[model samples]
Target: HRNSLIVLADVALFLALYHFLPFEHNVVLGISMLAFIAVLWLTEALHVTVTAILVPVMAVFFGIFETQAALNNFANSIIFLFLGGFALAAAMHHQGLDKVIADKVLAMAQGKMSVAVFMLFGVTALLSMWISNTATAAMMLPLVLGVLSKVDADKQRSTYVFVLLGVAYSASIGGIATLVGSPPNAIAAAEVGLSFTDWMKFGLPTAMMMLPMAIAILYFLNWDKGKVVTLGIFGLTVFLWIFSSPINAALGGFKSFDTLVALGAILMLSFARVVHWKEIQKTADWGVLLLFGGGLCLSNVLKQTGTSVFLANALSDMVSHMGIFVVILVVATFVVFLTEFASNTASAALLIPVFATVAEAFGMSPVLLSVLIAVAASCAFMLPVATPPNAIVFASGHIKQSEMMRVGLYLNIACIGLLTAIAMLFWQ
Candidate 1:
């Protein structure tokens, strides 16, 4: 009943605001749709995926998009690229390779306590690069607590908080390293037309640098693996995703490239019997697939209706006087904080296109601004609501909300600076 009321209020509020938008009726409707989705996503009045599917349904109903145009976004190439990635992730879990990899790395700590803590941070970040950060944190939380269990946790309370928060924080930081690692990364990559390798040119280095910065701040405050055919297949898949362009060039065709490589990995895993369709059916995140499609749909509508252009023109003029570095700094700061309360994917989906369009208005590189929004979306650390990893670890009941906020506040500020600096140095 409460959720229903919240949903109603959300609709009414946006509908009222719709009357005030100065754009054409179609663009106002489009902006209203964006607001409606954002509020629902933020408030949890509906399942995030439910809000996601609304993107196309509502756009079509509002006549902001044609039936075929609205439906086509669901079939965007980004959807298949991620679909194949999900299948591979499911396969890794089926083989028990995720845990195998974790155990192997933990053993390397060799009873050295300091090294063990660092290993926890390192391994979680690494696993999150390929698998969902939520799953990575869920897998790591138990292992983290089990390790913490042997310690005198009551006496080492700070240590307990550190280890637990470390797992959650690193999971997010690591996902920024790879396109397949996070939804926002994939969305930004696809929208910007960046291949996996193009994203890595900056993404890998950003994650590599941020991981240590995350560790240091969490120190001031607080602060995984897989199988053989599973391992070999995963490695080969990543290699192919990275090298697919040149390989395609050499072969004289595009060949559906990343998606093709991903599906090919699944085939190898199947032939080797490393994973089954049944396993994938149970483990794959089908909702996320829909969510991606819906987001693409919304972005497409916003662009096609001239809404993005209108929004971009205003934003460009507002920030035109500020240098690119300052613009990035402000935008990154906004996204990190906004994501603390909204779905990072939704946050990216709503903002990236507008900002990318803004970049175009200035005759700047759209890819750089798009990548900035994508990375910033994943950096939210202030609240459990900000990310799945944060929520997963928080569920353990060991850490308080206040502790997460205190520690997360520092990391958030630090990330804003780091992200801006990296962009200024390399991208400018």
Candidate 2:
């Protein structure tokens, strides 16, 4: 397996860091673990979940933290939030809710070319808010291909290019609208205590703005479409999630309110025979849950060992001369491109703690900065490897690599500017 040799390289690099770094023992251990995680993640030597499982194992193995503390990250509030999210997503998929929503939205497109493209964008984007963006893209790709198949062969090239890319692009945009929509989002939101409502307050609008921008970009680039179209469940769950602060206050503050809502919904769906246990089992993304735990474990180790502060101070010193606006642009731009080459989730997981600390060091709101970075992490559009959605669409074989790079590069630049402006408006 590629992983066996890669694992040795990781240990060698870890040992090198441990030996050469001038930091204290704990800090060195933490940094070493961080290097280990980053390399394994970047290389994809192991399943992402396997690497995630390693986070706690390595921490304990290397004595970075006690077994208890390292393991504790696996059980954090964020983990439960996502667990609930996974179940809701599974239930939705099981009940055919996702496809129904796609059909309903596409029916409204009415065979108008541009309208069809926009509807595909909208439906895919909307589905991605709660469902995985990759799943949204996967579901939407067939619909896009179906449309292209019916188009006049002479007219198909432009339609294929725009409609396919639209699905991929919107899926990415949609994930930025909610915390659970993406891993980086969940990491940043949980790290900074950005409530569900607070996240949607800015996130939803940001997504709405980006969706149209994507359509504009596609139209400007390809300017044609053959046709196409593109989930709901956990509707009550969302209402509760949005009004949770008030609901919790009224109900005397259930500490696990979000998780409770999710699990409660799962129970209702199961009891009503909306989703069976076997279907949930098949649909749930348990690997992601482990990845979340792993990322969280690393975050805690970094914080507990002062590695986060060390790195943050170093970063802060470099950017100390810049204002908050410039800092936002620089950081967001870095994250967007970084995500283009790395696992967006892993990139977010690895960087969130350090950047959150960087934000505090810069006298900016860490919450805003964290969310900004996370959302930026989701905006990578310049490569097929940049996102699962991008990869999914690329595999359809209609999109050329050069074409994706050409259009995606432009969108990447646009999103960088948009993200920077959004951060500026939201920053205190």
Candidate 3:
């Protein structure tokens, strides 16, 4: 009870309410069960890591499946790939690579806001690939501010909004590129069983190409992962993983090549004293990993128990003739708006499982559809409270709510449209 009787009462009430499931084995149960879980997930009333069992409990109690779907998805290679990424990223953080990259990239802008936004956005986005977006935002915050200070206040209004929004938006946008980039990306990979290479194939392109000017800012940035064998090994590991597919196409192919590359990098970095095992342990975000596995376990239960079929059938006709792109566009739209008011993680947890339930009904690739929904949630730009990154910048007192809104409204529309367009036309 943790000294709270209300906690016990809540659990007691829920347990008793289970009997009112009409005691019927039907899709109604599926909808109700999932809806309850979504509420729990969104409210953070219960930790999402335990979400699998909370979800599996009803299926088992109702005798919905001959066996509750095995937790095989938890064992999927995507999970291990994420594990390796965790290690590799930990090493980078340990070595201060993120800040290093920032310094080099920050040097790109002298006094121009037009030049500053793209440069700041690129470095922020890339750092986000290897570090948490929130941390990346904080790191880039000082650098962007130092630059912003050089601009006169009148110019600062528009420039301030642009830089803050750029940092915040890029933090979310960059997360799509790597498994460890963001929680939603990790969840999607687990649910879809995407290898690191596969995610880079689909998501990396969208992340990199979606904003061409920002993407092209690399032209002015020079990151010399200078040759200490230390830098070489680190760079090699990242390159190998990113291009694992082509590397294989050239010489040979391996099923788990991506995982191998990441693991290999971690080991080398470990022995080389580049990454401290203790620090890695301290820093590894076990919470996100746990939630990811739990989400997948719940997904398997819905998919295997025939609940998804009933669930899909119930909603399929409504979407029967609708193009898959339209359904996804609506889903992406829903999450983008939801995230403007809710935490991105909560928004992802609330919507992703439901989409899994009707992936077939929506007539879209679940992987791609999941990618779109998750990515759109990153478009939480208009409100300062929308995301921590946004909050971090707004706290500088340079960004105005009106400025955020005026700029945010357009950025939101542009990104939502870009997300759907890329998913529908390119990733599809």
Report clashes for each candidate as comma-separated counts. 5, 1, 0
Tens-place lDDT per residue, model 2, 1-428, is: 67789989888998899899987888788778888888888667887888889888877877677888788787767667766677777876765667766776777667776567667788888888988888889988888777655565754567667777888889989998987788778887677766677788878999989988877887876111211100234667788889988998899888867766767767766765666788777766788777877887877778777777777777766677887777788888888888889877867877787677656655667887788878888887877888899999989766788888888788888999888887888745
**lDDT sort, best first:** 1, 2, 3
**Model 2 residue 345 CA deviation in Å:** 1.2
Lowest summed lDDT across 10 adjacent residues in model 3 is found at 218-227
lDDT per residue, candidate 3, 27-94, as tens digits?
A: 44555566666656654556555554466566666665434354444565666666776777777776
Error of 2 at 382 (Å): 1.4
Error of 1 at 257 (Å): 0.9
Model 2's alpha-carbon lDDT is: 0.78
| Candidate 1 local lDDT, residue 205 | 96
lDDT of 1 by residue, 168-209 (tens): 989998898888888889878767777778888888899999
Model 3 pairs in collision: none
TM per model? 0.94, 0.92, 0.82
Candidate number of the best lDDT: 1
Question: Which candidate order results from sorting by TM-score in descending order?
Answer: 1, 2, 3
Whichever of 1 and 2 has more lDDT, that candidate is 1
lDDT of each: 0.81, 0.78, 0.68
Residue 53 C-alpha lDDT in model 2:
90
RMSD of each: 3.2, 4.8, 4.8
